[PDB]
């Protein structure tokens, strides 16, 4: 049982939120007998790598001496963006490729991460007046810029919030917001709309803070009480919530053109603005609908 590896060190340079990278290498069974290889967790872990990394494939069989290409894939999703933004984690790791009944091959993962305004907290964003990678704001300039664009160009946009944008454009939008305060956000209306949704979904702390979540549900049927739960939010969360509710009510006025109705808004934004750490799903939509109507 022996393996030959084309390389053992891999660099993931300038890693960005939601931008896929792949570092490929070739494994070749140079032994005299067939071998089984698989990536394994380092002593006392659950997984063989961190969330933003993946091996494809991560296990296999090799006769002597067939070869197999392994793809080491880096993808920073909403699960990891905040810890990488923060520096609580780094683009580094060790992959232990294991021969069943044999040697271990150590692969070293290195590189660097570029922080994004996406996956950054509303509070920190409201405290930063310049782009992340160039008295606090009432709302993050980045959410203002996205909503500003939609308000200007997308009020009459067919199927707004129902058609997915373009992956390329999404990334352009995020990079744009990370590095500039532009005169125009690039990309179609559908892209900007989806970037907004992604922004809300990427928030380390949802627009409606986690601890208020349960109170929201309980209060779901009394409009005077829902509004008061909202009052408990920190200033920037309260402002973003009110801002968005006002925006969505604005869009509802043009429903005959943009197809944005209360149904769709409820089901789409509820889960984004009101996350937990069933029929609670119903009190949630009810909670939101209370504000839209």
């Amino acid at each position: 049982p022996s393996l030959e590896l084309s390389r053992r060190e891999f660099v993931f340079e300038n890693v960005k939120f939601r931008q896929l990278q792949k570092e490929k290498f070739q494994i070749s069974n140079n032994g005299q007998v067939p071998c089984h290889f698989s990536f394994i967790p380092k002593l006392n872990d659950s997984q063989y790598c961190k969330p933003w990394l993946r091996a494809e494939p991560f296990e296999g069989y090799l006769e002597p001496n067939e070869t197999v290409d392994i793809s080491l894939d880096v993808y920073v999703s909403k699960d990891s963006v905040t810890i990488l933004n923060s520096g609580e984690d780094k683009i580094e790791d060790i992959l232990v490729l294991h021969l069943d009944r044999g040697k271990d091959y150590f692969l070293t993962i290195s590189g660097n991460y570029l922080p994004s305004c996406f996956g950054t907290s509303l509070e920190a964003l409201c405290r930063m007046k310049r782009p992340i990678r160039e008295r606090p704001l009432q709302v993050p300039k980045e959410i203002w810029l996205l909503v500003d664009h939609l308000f200007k160009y997308a009020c009459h946009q067919e199927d707004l919030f129902q058609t997915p944008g373009m992956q390329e454009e999404l990334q352009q939008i995020i990079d744009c917001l990370d590095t500039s305060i532009p005169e125009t956000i690039p990309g179609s209306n559908h892209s900007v709309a989806e970037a907004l949704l992604i922004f809300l979904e990427a928030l380390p702390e949802p627009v409606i803070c986690y601890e208020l979540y349960q109170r929201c549900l309980d209060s779901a049927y009394d409009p005077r009480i829902c509004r008061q739960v909202i009052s408990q939010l920190p200033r920037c969360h309260r402002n973003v919530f009110r801002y968005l509710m006002a925006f969505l009510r604005e869009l509802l006025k043009f429903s005959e053109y943009n197809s944005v109705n209360a149904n769709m808004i409820a089901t789409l934004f509820t889960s984004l603005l009101l996350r937990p750490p069933p029929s609670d799903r119903q009190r949630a939509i009810q909670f939101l609908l209370g504000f839209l109507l």
């Binding site: 704001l137 009432q138 300039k141 203002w144 909503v147 500003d148 308000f151 009110r242 925006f247 009510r249």
Partner: peptide
């Protein structure tokens, strides 16, 4: 009245 709020919140941008 969205445009009023939005204008205010765009202060400093």
């Amino acid at each position: 009245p969205f445009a009023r709020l939005h204008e205010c919140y765009g202060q400093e941008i």
